[PDB]
């Protein structure tokens, strides 16, 4: 992930019997999460700033359908980014507390390498997929 | 006429509990908000006659 490239971070070198919560690791993950939260907040701000120029400048009737179409996508998108920030913040509370890293349905533990991939993961691969199946079935 | 919970509120209340001038200002701003987001200028004057 270009995520590790933007920062001067190199893939984490997990040692054989390496634990999970030391001074250095939580200080390390706190910075990443804070930096990650701060970037999204700047992204949400830039989005709102771009949307207002369109709302302030009035397009010509002919290009209204194209401007309106593009304005709606940003808005939908903007609201999506705001949800993600709240999700990371929720994940930032899981690090500080003591209930991070396990599937919420069954006590099974979620993988270490899996959590580095999606730190917002709430379920293990088995439980998450069945939920998507019921979803397609309970919906459609 | 204070907010005892949140969420949108019905205009029937605003007129009843808070006043003829309160609800009229509620409509004009909340409709103009939609038009003014789209760059359309409609003087409140018109929206007022409808109210």
């Amino acid at each position: 992930l270009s995520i590790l490239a933007i920062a001067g971070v190199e893939p984490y070198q997990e040692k054989p019997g390496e634990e999970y919560m030391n001074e250095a690791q939580l200080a390390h993950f706190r910075r990443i999460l804070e930096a990650w939260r701060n970037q999204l907040r700047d992204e949400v701000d830039r989005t709102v700033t771009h949307m207002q120029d369109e709302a302030a400048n009035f397009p010509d009737p002919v290009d209204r359908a194209a401007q309106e179409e593009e304005f709606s996508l940003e808005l939908r998108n903007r609201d999506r980014e705001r949800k993600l920030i709240k999700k990371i913040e929720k994940t930032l509370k899981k690090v500080e507390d003591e209930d991070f890293g396990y599937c919420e349905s069954c006590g099974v533990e979620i993988g270490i390498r899996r959590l580095e991939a999606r730190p917002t993961a709430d379920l293990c691969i088995d439980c998450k997929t069945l939920a998507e199946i019921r979803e397609k079935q309970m919906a459609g | 006429g204070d907010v005892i919970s949140d969420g949108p509120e019905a205009p029937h209340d605003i007129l009843r509990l808070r006043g003829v001038h309160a609800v009229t200002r509620y409509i004009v701003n909340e409709v103009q908000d939609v038009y003014r987001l789209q760059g359309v200028k409609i003087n409140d004057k018109h929206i007022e006659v409808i109210v």
Binding site: P61 | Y35, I42, H46, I50
Partner: peptide, 30 residues
């Protein structure tokens, strides 16, 4: 630019003014 004249039928022209731009608003929810 002068003040509104006696007899002008402002009810209609009010209505008209609001309803013309209805084409420029989005019909979803946004």
């Amino acid at each position: 630019g002068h003040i509104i004249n006696k007899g002008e039928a402002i009810g209609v022209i009010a209505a008209q003014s609001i309803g013309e731009p209805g084409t420029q608003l989005t019909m979803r929810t946004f």
